[PDB]
Design a protein around this ligand. Structure first.
Ligand SMILES: OC[C@H]1O[C@@](CO)(O[C@H]2O[C@H](CO)[C@@H](O)[C@H](O)[C@H]2O)[C@@H](O)[C@@H]1O
Ligand SMILES: OC[C@H]1O[C@@](CO)(O[C@H]2O[C@H](CO)[C@@H](O)[C@H](O)[C@H]2O)[C@@H](O)[C@@H]1O
Ligand SMILES: OC[C@H]1O[C@@](CO)(O[C@H]2O[C@H](CO)[C@@H](O)[C@H](O)[C@H]2O)[C@@H](O)[C@@H]1O
Ligand SMILES: [Cu+2]
Ligand SMILES: [Cu+2]
Ligand SMILES: [Cu+2]
Ligand SMILES: [Cu+2]
Ligand SMILES: [Cu+2]
Ligand SMILES: [Cu+2]
Lengths: 334, 334, 334
């Protein structure tokens, strides 16, 4: 007999986040979301390597869901008949039934509706988990995203001061396991089922072939670079459902970071690089001080430069010579 | 001339913990423990793979030792003549002599008695360390456990409030390196000595064949699942003497977590997944809110599902529909 | 028009650190440093394995630079014509232009002068980053070091009390990727360019052949052991520009640790093992209580004992039997 107001959310594809309030005068609501599973072959690199992806809402990562502490999150999970496998959903933000996984197993052609109370604040992973060896395989195939549960008074610095972001981006990092043939080329497969045996053999060796942001090498570069202006406070939510990551903003800092991702704890200040434990999401806020190109990377630089894990920010504004200056340009040695 | 009262402890096999007080009105005591080394071939998986184990007290992990700050811990380490190698013990809780290792090297047929003052609170690893390349080999063969040093006033939340657990479990995670033959089957050996060359070659490649809790795949499942009731506050001590781990309670949380494991620091609150640095123990407390099956995993899901690192909790009590409910069971899509 | 006093620093090779004040009554200064790049073939192990190194100032790690909050750091980077490749420098302590990398790219025969304002306190990595796949390759070839930015009032414990160290050491950990030939011996190369193809293939597999402190197996052992006396408070700065590490002082503790390395955050107390995220530096302070040999390791014990990552401390002073004692020496079992 839960008679609270209902609110529908129109999810948007990462790295963007659906519109939301930080601090709110709204009381608890039932917030309604819909996720539709899509299994699909996608291209993950600039060489044309293909991958058997499985996704929530067609994206890797799945979209970021944003609610406030004490809301009830009501998700309709849909598994169309065009898919081949059973799927479910496990929210790390939720309490009971394996995070919802034990209540959401659906075959192709079915849907289910789960409600959970958002009793814990922070950013949290959600992922598919349809039992046994299928659990890692569905997650590393792309079936993961995140939810953010905000305090109703918004974020704070642990010393009584509000922290308000001007914009938020969600960076979902994906470790992928694409097998190679005898001569050393990546293999292509006709279905997720056909990719399973070779993929699992590689998975158990624990070394990914690719580590990407937003589903593909270079996804968050060029036309699709992240953007900001000097003076803007940007929140970057970072998740990794299976493997550790160490985010770093090249040329910047984490001014306020929740590396374990949970807003009941004060943020740490002034970090160079932070650590996202596999199976979690974290968040870092930075106020841009300088214009120009920044790279956002995992600071295993082999992964960042060679395996795919680099995003860019393009930042507009005025250069600050007090903070940094080229005193003397490259010249011949005296 | 140390004339304090003596107290003997009867150690018990993991995941259980010998009986102890949290807050105590006892003053410092000399607490007496005995560990007897056993080298033994064991089965580590449901396929019948064997492993040359080396253990404290016949178990992997070694038993949890519990004392209070300011106690003196007096350990009799015994290396029976039925063993083949020298062994020792290094306590991360202890100060000096390589943690005791430099004072406890014993050949088969010898015993030694070490006393150390428990000046640092928290959970800490202990492990064998008999010099050079033998150090990693004895540890990854199973020669590690943990000790817990409690404040005399018990645990607190860093904000002045007591945190009392209703029960404690010790989960020791073991990375194992079992070599394979040409056709790809795991190899069996007649002695630890015979397993050494092949095992060391694999170890140096840094990828385990198995990652297990309590010594074997499935050790903490079925009849041997962990248990709780709705409303019980459970402390889970987690150690990993060689390699990082990222614990996660599927369907729950870490309500209070000391991921670096040291009680001089306030716990973090409301975590989804925490991080145990290789060479350390950590502790997490959770009050169960929902009945049913939970899985406790490292959230590298490949390790958890495919390499062995999953435990279960079976929890009794009343389902809470406010926290989670299946609004609509699986049905055909409209 | 920046008219502050100038101060030159004479850098010294790691693990030592150039002389500096902790708390200072000096105001902001322009502190002047010079780094000269050297590409050179070096021996990294006791078997005589060679490696194509690239370094700042001829050392791995590069020297520790020490300044105070609000200083301006003016670095002359020199790339002599005896080198073969372009190089640059990226300071994680700096704000803008990819940490300075976008302003410091120099060919063999050129130098550049960069100034940045030290607005963030802590220890921070610096490394070369000359674009694309070259970034990881130059870093894992040895082109990284660290800078320490002290509060002007020196270090504190977060509870109002000064923490003053008696001496500081800088331990730079390097993951190295040396390829093997068919029969399994490590390969030697005539130039960094010639080592590139084989080295990159190995790098992308993410498993190092060697993990060393101060450039070589055994660098910080024997005549070159670290030293202290009972009663001395020693700060150990640890960096790792590419890969995670888990420092541990065998027989000691981290009395005060900033594992994310940033002095705006209070240190954690009483750690056994701490965690240095790849792409960062951290710092730990310990007051020695016992004489004798200590080992300082990463507590992946395979890396420590088998791949090269062990340093020693030799500590003078009086043994404390209250803290630890051998109650009974090794004797035959009754
Ligand atoms: O040329 C035959 C020879 O090649 C190997 C690979 O070294 O196997 C290749 O050819 C087989 C027969 O065509 C294929 O089945 C196999 O997939 C392919 O690798 C050898 O095993 C074989 O003797
Ligand atoms: O059949 C001989 C042929 O097999 C190889 C493996 O490819 O070696 C196998 O046989 C050897 C002789 O019986 C064994 O010593 C060895 O352990 C086994 O792998 C080849 O090396 C050999 O030419
Ligand atoms: O002995 C020839 C035989 O050896 C292999 C390695 O198994 O190749 C070796 O010899 C080649 C010719 O000398 C070299 O080019 C190569 O580098 C070396 O590995 C086989 O490929 C070849 O059939
Ligand atoms: Cu799925
Ligand atoms: Cu999960
Ligand atoms: Cu041993
Ligand atoms: Cu140890
Ligand atoms: Cu360089
Ligand atoms: Cu960097």
């Amino acid at each position: 007999d839960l008679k609270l107001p209902r609110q529908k959310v129109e999810l948007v594809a990462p790295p963007f986040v659906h519109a939301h309030e930080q601090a709110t005068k709204q009381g608890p609501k039932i917030v309604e979301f819909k996720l539709t599973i899509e299994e699909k072959k996608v291209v993950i690199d600039e060489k044309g390597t293909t991958f058997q992806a499985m996704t929530f809402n067609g994206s890797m990562p799945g979209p970021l869901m944003v609610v406030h502490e004490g809301d009830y999150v009501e998700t309709t999970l849909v598994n169309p008949a065009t898919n081949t496998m059973p799927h479910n959903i496990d929210f790390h933000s939720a309490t009971g039934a394996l995070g919802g996984g034990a209540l959401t197993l659906i075959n192709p052609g079915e849907q289910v509706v789960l409600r959970w109370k958002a009793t814990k604040t922070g950013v949290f992973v959600y992922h598919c988990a349809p039992g046994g060896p299928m659990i890692p395989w569905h997650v590393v195939s792309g079936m993961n995203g995140a939810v953010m549960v905000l305090p109703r008074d918004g974020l704070n610095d642990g010393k009584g001061h509000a922290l308000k972001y001007d914009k938020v981006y969600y960076v979902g990092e994906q470790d992928m396991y694409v097998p190679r043939d005898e001569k050393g080329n990546f293999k292509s497969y006709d279905s997720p089922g056909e990719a399973f045996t070779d993929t699992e053999e590689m998975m158990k060796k624990l070394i990914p072939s690719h580590v990407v942001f937003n589903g593909k090498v270079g996804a968050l570069t060029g036309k699709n670079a992240l953007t900001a202006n000097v003076g803007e406070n940007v929140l970057i939510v970072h998740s990794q459902a299976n493997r550790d990551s160490r985010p770093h903003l090249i040329g910047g800092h984490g001014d306020y970071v929740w590396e374990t991702g949970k807003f009941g704890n004060a943020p740490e200040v002034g970090l160079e690089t932070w650590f996202i434990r596999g199976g979690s999401a974290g968040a870092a806020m930075y106020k841009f001080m300088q214009p120009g190109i920044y790279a956002y990377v995992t600071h295993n630089l082999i992964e960042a430069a060679d395996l795919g894990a680099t995003a860019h920010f393009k930042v507009e504004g005025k250069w600050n010579d007090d903070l940094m200056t080229q005193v003397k340009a490259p010249a011949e040695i005296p």
